[PDB]
Amino acid sequence: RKRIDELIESGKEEGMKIDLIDGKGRGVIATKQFSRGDFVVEYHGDLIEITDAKKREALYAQDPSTGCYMYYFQYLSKTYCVDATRETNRLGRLINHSKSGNCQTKLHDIDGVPHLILIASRDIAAGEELLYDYGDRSKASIEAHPWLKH
Amino acid sequence: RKSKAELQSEERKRIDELIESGKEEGMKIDLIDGKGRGVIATKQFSRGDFVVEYHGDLIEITDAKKREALYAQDPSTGCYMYYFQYLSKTYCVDATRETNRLGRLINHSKSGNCQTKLHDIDGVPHLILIASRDIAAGEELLYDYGDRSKASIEAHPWLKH
Numbered sequence: 001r002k003r004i005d006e007l008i009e010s011g012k013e014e015g016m017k018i019d020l021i022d023g024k025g026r027g028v029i030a031t032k033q034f035s036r037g038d039f040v041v042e043y044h045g046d047l048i049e050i051t052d053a054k055k056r057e058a059l060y061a062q063d064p065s066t067g068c069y070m071y072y073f074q075y076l077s078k079t080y081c082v083d084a085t086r087e088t089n090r091l092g093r094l095i096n097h098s099k100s101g102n103c104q105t106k107l108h109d110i111d112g113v114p115h116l117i118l119i120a121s122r123d124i125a126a127g128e129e130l131l132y133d134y135g136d137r138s139k140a141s142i143e144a145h146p147w148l149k150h
Numbered sequence: 151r152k153s154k155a156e157l158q159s160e161e162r163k164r165i166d167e168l169i170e171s172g173k174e175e176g177m178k179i180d181l182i183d184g185k186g187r188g189v190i191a192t193k194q195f196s197r198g199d200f201v202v203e204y205h206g207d208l209i210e211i212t213d214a215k216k217r218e219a220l221y222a223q224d225p226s227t228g229c230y231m232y233y234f235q236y237l238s239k240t241y242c243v244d245a246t247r248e249t250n251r252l253g254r255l256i257n258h259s260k261s262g263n264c265q266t267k268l269h270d271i272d273g274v275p276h277l278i279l280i281a282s283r284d285i286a287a288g289e290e291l292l293y294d295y296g297d298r299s300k301a302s303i304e305a306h307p308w309l310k311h
């Protein structure tokens with residue numbers, strides 16, 4: 001917990017660089033080794049609580065156009081979304097998809113505050129592109145974005 | 151003979167009817183390698199013919215911070231929104247929501263066979279696609295997505311062609 005919380009809180013985002021990757025646009029490359037289980041980066045965006053039926057139905061219907069930049073989770077009895085659609089200097093939102101990626105999402109708690117983070121699912125070598133499973137997407141998203149299959 | 155004014159008034163009413171009826175004939179959806187879904191012509195279109203409306207939620211943008219927020223979302227959502235100025239106003243056609251409409255499924259090319267045009271009905275601007283050259287049945291419809299941010303070009307380098 002201790003060292004991970006400071007990494008989250010400072011927003012240091014060390015050990016990573018942005019590159020332009022053929023077929024993907026921008027992506028994030030590791031510039032240091034990460035060990036299995038290490039914190040890599042926060043999936044940092046605007047935390048939205050989804051409580052309105054209009055918003056809920058709109059987000060569902062926007063899955064192909066915007067769903068690559070929104071990550072849904074439940075925390076306690078509420079449905080949340082980290083909306084990363086806005087350009088910032090944060091790196092989590094530039095990480096590309098793979099079903100067999102070297103990172104995986106986890107909910108991390110800081111005195112109850114929910115943070116969606118990426119942890120290393122295996123040892124990662126310097127020079128590897130960071131990737132994680134974007135998760136559930138609609139049929140239309142899979143037709144729009146067939147790279148979601150792998 | 152009907153005069154130019156009557157003939158031009160009549161031609162406007164034809165585009166009006168196509169927009170308002172929302173028929174979208176002569177087009178089908180295909181899955182296209184490297185692009186996802188795209189729209190294919192199933193009939194010939196002639197240069198200048200109405201192809202389809204870019205149909206979505208028309209939003210007047212009235213605030214500089216909102217224009218800035220749209221710019222900041224251009225890589226993530228900008229392919230499915232079309233921003234334009236019309237007289238004193240700025241608008242965005244927000245086509246992010248999945249619907250049965252085809253205009254929003256048309257892919258990009260800088261040298262595409264369609265082009266955008268504004269068409270005013272009762273003071274409301276409609277954004278339409280017309281054919282920029284004769285189009286054969288079997289061709290993918292394509293148009294220029296237009297001005298995009300630098301970040302968008304990095305996210306979407308196919309925007310350059």
Ligand SMILES: C[S@@+](CC[C@H](N)C(=O)[O-])C[C@H]1O[C@@H](n2cnc3c(N)ncnc32)[C@H](O)[C@@H]1O
Binds near residue numbers: 145257258
């Ligand atoms: C408005 S949509 C068009 C329909 C889209 N292909 C779909 O399946 O939803 C915009 C998206 O289409 C894709 N796209 C459009 N033109 C493209 C092109 N020339 N090359 C590669 N991908 C393209 C990109 O994924 C883009 O963000």
Ligand SMILES: C[S@@+](CC[C@H](N)C(=O)[O-])C[C@H]1O[C@@H](n2cnc3c(N)ncnc32)[C@H](O)[C@@H]1O
Binds near residue numbers: 023068093097
């Ligand atoms: C959250 S972003 C990641 C950063 C993105 N590449 C960019 O430059 O903004 C999501 C978008 O990245 C691209 N992408 C992500 N994973 C991909 C993959 N495995 N293959 C191809 N494109 C991918 C798609 O354009 C997707 O809609």
